[PDB]
Design an enzyme around this catalytic site. Structure first.
Site, PDB file in Angstrom:
ATOM      1  N   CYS A 293       0.852  -1.158  -0.142  1.00  0.00           N
ATOM      2  CA  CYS A 293      -0.154   0.022  -0.152  1.00  0.00           C
ATOM      3  C   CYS A 293       0.937   1.490  -0.057  1.00  0.00           C
ATOM      4  CB  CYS A 293      -1.157  -0.204   1.157  1.00  0.00           C
ATOM      5  SG  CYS A 293      -1.758   1.529   1.568  1.00  0.00           S
TER       6      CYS A 293
ATOM      7  N   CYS B  21       0.428   3.760   2.446  1.00  0.00           N
ATOM      8  CA  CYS B  21       0.631   3.353   3.931  1.00  0.00           C
ATOM      9  C   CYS B  21       2.216   3.672   4.237  1.00  0.00           C
ATOM     10  CB  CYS B  21       0.415   2.021   3.839  1.00  0.00           C
ATOM     11  SG  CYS B  21      -1.179   1.645   3.957  1.00  0.00           S
TER      12      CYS B  21
END
Length: 111
Positions: free
Chosen positions: A35, A38
């Site tokens: 991600c 992230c």
């Protein structure tokens, strides 16, 4: 104070029971290695953990500890979840740096 990476259900348990006994705020970063946003929020989260050493900052990979991501219905990442004495106080969904920072300030605050 550091971000604890919570890899097992046991570490989850220990970290939550201990924070609750101490009545500390728990901030959790639900994250995934694939991600993009992230990876980008990792240093921000890390910096807030240093700045608020009386709150416990946890990181949980949604792919590794599925039951924990699932109990909180976390299907978007990153999701920052704020919890104290069993109650979910707040959530930030996405890489929203000012929203994370503000709610850490508000919830870590001399209550």
């Amino acid at each position: 104070a550091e971000v604890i990476s919570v890899h097992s259900l046991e570490q989850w348990t220990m970290q939550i029971e201990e924070a609750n006994t101490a009545k500390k705020l728990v901030v959790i970063d639900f994250t995934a290695s694939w991600c993009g946003p992230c990876r980008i929020m990792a240093p921000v989260f890390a910096d807030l953990a240093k700045k608020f050493p009386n709150a416990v900052f946890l990181k949980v990979d949604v792919d590794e500890l599925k039951p924990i991501a699932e109990q909180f219905s976390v299907e978007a990442m990153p999701t920052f979840l704020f919890m104290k004495e069993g109650d979910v106080k707040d959530r930030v969904v996405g890489a929203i740096k000012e929203e994370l920072t503000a709610k850490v300030g508000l919830h870590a605050a001399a209550q």
